[PDB]
Design an enzyme around this catalytic site. Structure first.
Site, PDB file in Angstrom:
ATOM      1  N   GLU B  69      18.371   7.718  45.620  1.00  0.00           N
ATOM      2  CA  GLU B  69      19.554   6.947  45.255  1.00  0.00           C
ATOM      3  C   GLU B  69      20.833   7.411  45.937  1.00  0.00           C
ATOM      4  O   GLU B  69      21.794   7.835  45.289  1.00  0.00           O
ATOM      5  CB  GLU B  69      19.691   6.878  43.738  1.00  0.00           C
ATOM      6  CG  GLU B  69      18.475   6.256  43.100  1.00  0.00           C
ATOM      7  CD  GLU B  69      18.635   6.011  41.617  1.00  0.00           C
ATOM      8  OE1 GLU B  69      18.808   7.002  40.871  1.00  0.00           O
ATOM      9  OE2 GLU B  69      18.569   4.827  41.201  1.00  0.00           O
ATOM     10  N   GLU B 145       9.114   4.999  41.187  1.00  0.00           N
ATOM     11  CA  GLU B 145       9.475   4.911  39.771  1.00  0.00           C
ATOM     12  C   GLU B 145       9.041   3.526  39.288  1.00  0.00           C
ATOM     13  O   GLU B 145       9.337   2.528  39.949  1.00  0.00           O
ATOM     14  CB  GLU B 145      10.994   5.072  39.547  1.00  0.00           C
ATOM     15  CG  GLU B 145      11.600   6.453  39.826  1.00  0.00           C
ATOM     16  CD  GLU B 145      13.136   6.477  39.765  1.00  0.00           C
ATOM     17  OE1 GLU B 145      13.751   5.781  38.908  1.00  0.00           O
ATOM     18  OE2 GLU B 145      13.738   7.216  40.576  1.00  0.00           O
ATOM     19  N   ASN B 205      30.291   8.954  28.501  1.00  0.00           N
ATOM     20  CA  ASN B 205      28.856   9.262  28.457  1.00  0.00           C
ATOM     21  C   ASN B 205      27.971   8.015  28.473  1.00  0.00           C
ATOM     22  O   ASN B 205      28.473   6.896  28.374  1.00  0.00           O
ATOM     23  CB  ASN B 205      28.529  10.129  27.236  1.00  0.00           C
ATOM     24  CG  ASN B 205      28.682   9.374  25.934  1.00  0.00           C
ATOM     25  OD1 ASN B 205      27.813   8.585  25.560  1.00  0.00           O
ATOM     26  ND2 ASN B 205      29.795   9.607  25.238  1.00  0.00           N
ATOM     27  N   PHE B 209      20.499   6.879  27.062  1.00  0.00           N
ATOM     28  CA  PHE B 209      19.811   6.646  28.345  1.00  0.00           C
ATOM     29  C   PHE B 209      19.109   7.867  28.943  1.00  0.00           C
ATOM     30  O   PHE B 209      18.263   7.729  29.821  1.00  0.00           O
ATOM     31  CB  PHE B 209      20.696   5.914  29.363  1.00  0.00           C
ATOM     32  CG  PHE B 209      20.546   4.418  29.306  1.00  0.00           C
ATOM     33  CD1 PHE B 209      19.531   3.781  30.021  1.00  0.00           C
ATOM     34  CD2 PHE B 209      21.393   3.648  28.503  1.00  0.00           C
ATOM     35  CE1 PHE B 209      19.375   2.396  29.950  1.00  0.00           C
ATOM     36  CE2 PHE B 209      21.249   2.263  28.420  1.00  0.00           C
ATOM     37  CZ  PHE B 209      20.242   1.631  29.145  1.00  0.00           C
TER      38      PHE B 209
HETATM   39 NA    NA Z   1      17.559   8.050  32.419  1.00  0.00          NA
END
Ligand code: NA
Ligand SMILES: [Mg+2]
Ligand code: NA
Lengths: 210, 211
Positions: B69, B145, B205, B209
């Site tokens: 990424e 992923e 924040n 997640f």
């Molecule tokens: Na995550």
């Protein structure tokens, strides 16, 4: 008087095992053709293009039979309706091909065509090509002709392309069949078939299987 | 790169390993602002080259990864080539910039679906079945992923595996991910409870997640 003896079965039958009615006889046209002694015995037309399709070269190879003479000429002329768009004239005697020379009975004509109207099933643009065998001085011996559509067909990067764009075949298989006349074909029927096909979003046909 | 002992353990028990350089610039606008910048090349090289130097003898490491990424910059292409040159023994992969750039031996998308296309501008996620057969494409596809296991999740997992089996060039993937990143906090009685983002006065924040 003509006499024709037609056999139903032959060694040819072993290669004609299509899924269809098995029939026989003289089922297509018979005709009689008169040609001169010095004549056009064959001709090929090709069309190739630049990358954006704004220039084309039409290439026509012509062959003759009869006696070879220096005065002989071919002219290939390209027409769009009543307008002549290109023309070429040349004596016989092709390029050198090998250690023994070239075809003295052949000639290649190349015509430049700018911004050609292209042929596709969406817009079937056609030119008329006329092939004349004649004397230097311009006296016709005979002429043949065909319809010409400027189009490129190539496979690149795994795609079949027509004029640079990827095709999508909306096709059908069509045998030649009529319920009354069997396997004899006529214009009225053929035209009836093509209209129905196009009215129903088809753009392609396969001559199954001959 | 992980704790050195992890590679030892994977050699001995038997697991295949993707070893990944410490490079991720997700928050940049656009994502390749640093990795396309030649002034950040030396900093990036040291994170790739020192990984290869430390880890190149473990048999469990079968694939090298250039990071994650960080878009696709010319720094990736240079470093891809560095690895292919000092160690021909292992394929190199990298996901950024559309999963199929000139910096990867393996089409490695993240979260690409089985049958459904997601045609994002510039970096689309094609259905994996479709992706293999794109004009002129020949490489194998292995999701880096897929099947995000956040909370009550993993619906449609069967669908990937039916496809993995049917397609020779679909060679599977890496589920995201193994273990919840929650931390321990205590109440007034000394009872522990599991915490996520936000629970330390940390702000801004991204809440749950991390699990
Ligand atoms: Na995550
Ligand atoms: Mg059959
Ligand atoms: Na497979």
């Amino acid at each position: 008087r003509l006499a024709v003896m037609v056999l139903r079965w032959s060694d040819g039958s072993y290669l004609e095992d299509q899924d269809m009615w098995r029939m026989s006889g003289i089922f297509r046209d018979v005709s009689l053709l008169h040609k001169p002694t010095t004549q056009i015995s064959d001709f090929h037309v090709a069309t190739r293009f630049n990358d954006d399709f704004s220039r084309a070269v039409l290439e026509a190879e012509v062959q003759m039979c009869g006696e070879l003479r220096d005065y002989l000429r071919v002219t290939v002329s390209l027409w769009q309706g009543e307008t002549q768009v290109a023309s070429g004239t040349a004596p016989f005697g092709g390029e050198i091909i090998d250690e023994r020379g070239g075809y003295a009975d052949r000639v290649t004509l190349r015509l430049n065509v700018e911004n050609p109207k292209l042929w596709s099933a969406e817009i079937p643009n056609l030119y008329r090509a006329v092939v004349e065998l004649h004397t230097a001085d311009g006296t016709l011996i005979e002429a043949e002709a065909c319809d010409v559509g400027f189009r490129e067909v190539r496979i690149e990067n795994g795609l079949l392309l027509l004029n640079g764009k990827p095709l999508l075949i909306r096709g059908v298989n069509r045998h030649e069949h009529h319920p009354l006349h069997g396997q004899v074909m006529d214009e009225q029927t053929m035209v009836q078939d093509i209209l129905l096909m196009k009215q129903n979003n088809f753009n392609a046909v396969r001559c199954s299987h001959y | 790169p992980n704790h050195p002992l992890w590679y030892t353990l994977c050699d001995r028990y038997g697991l295949y390993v993707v070893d990944e350089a410490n490079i991720e610039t997700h928050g940049m606008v656009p994502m390749n602002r640093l990795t396309d910048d030649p002034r950040w090349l030396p900093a990036m090289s040291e994170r790739v080259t020192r990984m290869v130097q430390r880890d190149r003898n473990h048999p469990s490491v079968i694939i090298w990864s250039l990071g994650t990424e960080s878009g696709h910059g010319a720094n990736h292409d240079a470093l891809y080539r560095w690895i292919k040159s000092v160690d021909p023994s292992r394929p190199v992969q990298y996901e950024g910039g559309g999963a199929d750039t000139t910096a990867t031996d393996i089409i490695c998308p993240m979260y690409a679906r089985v049958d459904e296309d997601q045609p994002f501008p510039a970096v689309p996620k094609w259905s994996i079945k479709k992706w293999l057969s794109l004009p002129g494409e020949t490489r194998p596809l292995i999701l880096c992923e897929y099947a995000h296991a956040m909370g009550n999740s993993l619906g449609g997992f069967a669908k990937y595996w039916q496809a993995f089996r049917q397609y020779p060039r679909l060679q599977g993937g890496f589920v995201w991910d193994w273990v919840d990143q929650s931390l321990i906090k205590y109440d007034e009685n000394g009872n522990p409870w599991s915490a996520y983002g936000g629970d330390f006065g940390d702000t801004p924040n991204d809440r749950q997640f991390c699990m």
